[PDB]
């Protein structure tokens, strides 16, 4: 229940400064802000920073609580795939302080973030399935990943040659008409992909001529030129009568 969790988080906002010292609240409040907002899909890198700020407050607390705490933050590095904070965290003394079993399995999970590599990703997906169960939201984490990795693999095969047949290139992605080809059509709507397909002969042809410096810089000024005359129409009509 997300609205109930926000109401529970809202009650923690006024309770943080209510008593004298939290003693630890805002550290957990920022962690709770990195959960509900993570389900709200507000922002990734900032929510990942809340797991980093909470990890700084996790120093000298119950180890069974800190051994499952790295399950959330290191899998968050898997969701983002571009946190840019990788080298900062994992190279520090605080992230490497845990030598235990489960965290060593998370050490290669944090390495799997630097891995990507679909063929490797589909493999470690089964090896890390034990850590997949502790994922708070299993759908949102791996769906955006695999959907982002889709077009990451799509831009690789379409790049070398301009036009591509859609029957052979879809055999690598295992299907054509159901979803994939509709996802490539959505990339045209998002401008990430420039090209057009052919349903009859099954060939995707990429063609682009984006720049036009003659039409755009002209018509915009002519429309502005109308505003120059319309504003002068007040001078014209008033001086005559």
């Amino acid at each position: 229940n997300l609205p109930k969790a926000r109401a529970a988080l809202t009650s923690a906002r006024t309770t943080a400064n209510a008593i004298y010292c939290p003693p630890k609240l805002q550290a957990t409040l920022d962690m709770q802000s990195g959960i509900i907002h993570a389900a709200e899909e507000k922002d990734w890198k900032t929510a990942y920073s809340y797991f980093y700020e909470a990890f700084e407050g996790y120093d000298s607390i119950d180890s069974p609580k800190a051994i499952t705490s790295l399950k959330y933050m290191l899998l968050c590095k898997i969701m983002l795939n571009t946190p840019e904070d990788v080298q900062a965290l994992v190279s520090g003394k605080l992230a490497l302080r845990y030598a235990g079993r489960q965290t060593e399995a998370l050490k290669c999970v944090a390495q799997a973030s630097k891995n990507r590599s679909l063929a490797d990703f589909e493999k470690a997906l089964t090896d890390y399935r034990a850590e997949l169960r502790d994922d708070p939201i299993i759908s949102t984490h791996l769906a955006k990943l695999y959907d982002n990795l889709l077009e990451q693999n799509l831009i690789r095969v379409i790049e070398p040659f301009s036009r591509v047949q859609i029957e052979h290139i879809s055999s690598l992605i295992k299907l054509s008409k159901a979803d994939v080809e509709r996802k490539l059509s959505q990339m045209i709507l998002d401008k990430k992909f420039h090209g057009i397909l052919d349903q009859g002969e099954g060939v995707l042809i990429i063609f682009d001529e984006p720049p036009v410096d003659k039409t755009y810089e002209a018509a915009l000024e002519t429309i502005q030129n109308m505003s120059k005359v319309v504003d002068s129409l007040y001078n014209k009509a008033k001086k005559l009568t």
Binding site: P3, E40, R182, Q199, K236
Partner: protein, 378 residues
């Protein structure tokens, strides 16, 4: 002191289109009659709803109690003016005299408004006038006074800033933009969102979320659409509480047309049962279609209507005349072949037509400065 009577305005529209319930609308109106001392709310409803039987002395002892309350406000103006003060006497009488406008007809309206409009030294008391013309302009269908009072509120109170009652104009002018047809300024003035929070004049803010989301799916473009809801914080939690509204926004980005005939019909059901949307629900239907058809045809240069029947389930003769009456009206010009199951896009509208607006406006405009040049001499 609006939402109780503002719901009576919803009761007026509740009786308008459907004839089914005349009892359900008159029971909560009598419950609104026994309080607030409403006279005109049940006077004009007496013609639309049932004529009874009898109200009369049952509600006449309330207007007699109003008469005792009206005469004590009249006794308040000459008794308090015996002393001297700034706005203390005249503001105390106008707020409750504008409440006497809530009793009935135009009597309390015109006597309170124009009398106290001169002495007011604050922009807040001048807006209470404008605020109470907008509520009676909501009750009665007259569009005259609601355009005039907002014009007076924009000159005096905007000088100048304010946090609250200036943002209410963005809601009211935004409600005027949604009352008439204005797509761009409506969603633009609705960007305040939770900054206005909830007020007696703002009713339920969740209903205001439904008002700003219906104008956002048209005027706000698809790149900007997903940009506002995703990146938005306070506007995101209010749409998440509504599963039907949130599913429509995610489906609009998902482009699946199987749920559009369902979800939009549910939205159209709300469009039918809401006031001021009666003349405007006819164009809104197909406007979201071309909004979905825009990105649709952009996918493939050659498209088959058999593939359209998949998501439409099953469009065959429906989209035939549909898309035909679109291109004929100048909405999403395209070439769709019949019995050959071929759609052609194109249309390269960034080349030929973009040069035409030059001489198009350059005809009537330049003709005006022609006659204007013939004025000299004589």
């Amino acid at each position: 002191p609006k939402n109780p009577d503002l719901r009576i305005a919803q009761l007026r529209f509740l009786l308008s289109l459907p004839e089914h319930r005349g009892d359900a609308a008159v029971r909560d109106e009598l419950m609104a009659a026994v309080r607030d001392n409403n006279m005109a709310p049940y006077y004009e409803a007496l013609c639309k709803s049932l004529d009874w039987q009898i109200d009369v002395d049952l509600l006449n002892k309330m207007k007699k109690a109003n008469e005792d309350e009206l005469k004590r406000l009249d006794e308040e103006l000459e008794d308090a003016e015996k002393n001297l003060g700034e706005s203390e006497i005249r503001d105390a009488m106008m707020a409750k005299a504008e409440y006497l406008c809530r009793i009935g007809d135009k009597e309390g309206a015109l006597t309170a408004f124009r009398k106290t409009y001169d002495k007011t030294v604050a922009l807040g008391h001048r807006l209470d006038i404008v605020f109470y013309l907008l509520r009676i302009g909501l009750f009665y269908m007259d569009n005259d006074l609601i355009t005039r009072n907002t014009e007076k509120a924009k000159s005096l109170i905007e000088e100048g800033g304010d946090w609250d009652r200036r943002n209410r104009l963005k809601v009211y002018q935004g409600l005027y933009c949604v009352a008439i047809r204005d797509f761009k300024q409506a969603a633009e003035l609705f960007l305040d969102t939770v900054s206005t929070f909830t007020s007696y004049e703002l009713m339920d803010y969740k209903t205001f979320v439904t008002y700003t989301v219906y104008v956002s799916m048209i005027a706000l473009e698809r790149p900007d659409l997903r940009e506002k809801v995703i990146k938005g914080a306070e506007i995101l939690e209010v749409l998440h509480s509504l599963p039907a509204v949130r599913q429509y926004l995610f489906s609009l980005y998902e482009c699946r047309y199987s749920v559009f005939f369902q979800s939009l019909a549910v939205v159209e059901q709300e469009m039918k049962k809401d006031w001021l949307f009666a003349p405007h629900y006819r164009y809104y239907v197909r406007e979201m279609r071309i909004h979905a058809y825009s990105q649709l045809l952009e996918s493939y240069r050659s498209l088959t209507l058999g593939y359209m029947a998949e998501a439409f389930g099953v469009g065959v003769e429906f989209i035939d005349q549909e898309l035909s009456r679109f291109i004929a009206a100048g909405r999403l010009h395209c070439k769709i072949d019949k019995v050959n199951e071929i759609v052609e896009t194109n249309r390269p509208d960034s080349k030929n037509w973009q040069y035409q607006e030059t001489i198009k406006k350059g005809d009537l405009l330049l003709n005006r400065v022609q006659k204007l040049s013939r004025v000299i001499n004589m």
